[PDB]
From Swiss-Prot:
Name of the gene: JAK2
PTMs per UniProt: Autophosphorylated, leading to regulate its activity. Also phosphorylated by TEC. Phosphorylated on tyrosine residues in response to interferon gamma signaling. Phosphorylated on tyrosine residues in response to a signaling cascade that is activated by increased cellular retinol. Undergoes Notch-induced ubiquitination and subsequent proteasomal degradation which is mediated by ASB1 or ASB2, the substrate-recognition components of probable ECS E3 ubiquitin-protein ligase complexes.
PTM annotation (Phosphotyrosine): residues: 34
Protein name: Tyrosine-protein kinase JAK2
Subcellular location: Endomembrane system; Cytoplasm; Nucleus
């Protein structure tokens, strides 16, 4: 990673939290192209000091995204570890996380918008699959909206997939159960069962989020009931706008070997 000086970073408003992390908007003073000074908006992810033991995992996640370059992957500017702090410095995406955006804009997000955003996420996951890189935490909160749909231009929305945060392979089991149904059944059984097929399951759950106006599947169920949901081999209910329901269910296959490749997922999406 590129090491960024603390003096060059300015923390501003809190933009929420991740697992064991606080997220902030920030400003980075930098020498840009042609040597001109800029103040660039950045996103700052701070690992909680009480959870500093996850430092490695915390950075590994983002490191995984940094070794590949792709239009649908969020950019990492680097890290600030000068001091007790563990700071990750990423690009600031203007319109924030997709789950929030889907909630706030639900009244005017239609089927074509959902299909375009699903195609983009599928394309990003296909890039990862082709590179045999496991994301491990595909969810609508980890999708960021770079630009909104502009029907006057014909411009579609454009999304980027963010880093997965601290790996489910090292997280406490109660946090893993709270993350049902994003975390696949096999990973509840064994978190070290982290595979490429994991991302197909989680992509299905994310599609459900995208089609459900930002609702959280199974949120009414506590941890015991989410566990039982997997034990009883249930599927999520079809969204009211059910045009993606079969794809959601084909991705959320309890048999990981039977989950479709992202090429087949993309061919389905195009067929819709
Ligand atoms: C880089 N990045 C992330 O990795 C993740 S992963 C899960 C959440 C994020 N976050 C917080 C982000 N929010 C943003 N920009 C942004 C813009 C507007 C708003 S809002 N809804 O307050 O107006 C929030 C975040 N830009 C980028 C991110």
């Amino acid at each position: 990673f590129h090491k960024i000086r603390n003096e060059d970073l300015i923390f501003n408003e809190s933009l929420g939290q991740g697992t064991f992390t606080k997220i902030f908007k920030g400003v980075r003073r930098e020498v840009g192209d042609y040597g001109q000074l800029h103040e660039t908006e950045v996103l700052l992810k701070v690992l909680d000091k009480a959870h500093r033991n996850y430092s490695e995992s915390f950075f590994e996640a983002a490191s995984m995204m940094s070794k590949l370059s792709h239009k649908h992957l969020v950019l990492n500017y680097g890290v600030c570890v000068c001091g007790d702090e563990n700071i990750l410095v990423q690009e600031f995406v203007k319109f924030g996380s997709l789950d929030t955006y889907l909630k706030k804009n639900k009244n005017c997000i239609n089927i074509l918008w959902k299909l375009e955003v699903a195609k983009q996420l599928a394309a990003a996951m296909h890039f990862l699959e082709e590179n045999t890189l496991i994301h491990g935490n595909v969810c609508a909160k980890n999708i960021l909206l770079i630009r909104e749909e502009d029907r006057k231009t014909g411009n579609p929305p454009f999304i980027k997939l963010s880093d997965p945060g601290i790996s489910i392979t090292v997280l406490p089991k109660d946090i893993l159960q709270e993350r049902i149904p994003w975390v696949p059944p096999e990973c509840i059984e064994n978190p070290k069962n982290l595979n490429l097929a994991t991302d197909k399951w989680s992509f299905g759950t994310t599609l459900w989020e995208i089609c459900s106006g930002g609702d959280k599947p199974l949120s009414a169920l506590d941890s015991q009931r989410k566990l039982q949901f997997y034990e009883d081999r249930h599927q999520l209910p079809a969204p009211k706008a059910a045009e993606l329901a079969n794809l959601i269910n084909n991705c959320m296959d309890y048999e990981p070997d039977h989950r479709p490749s992202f090429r087949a997922i993309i061919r389905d999406l195009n067929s819709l």
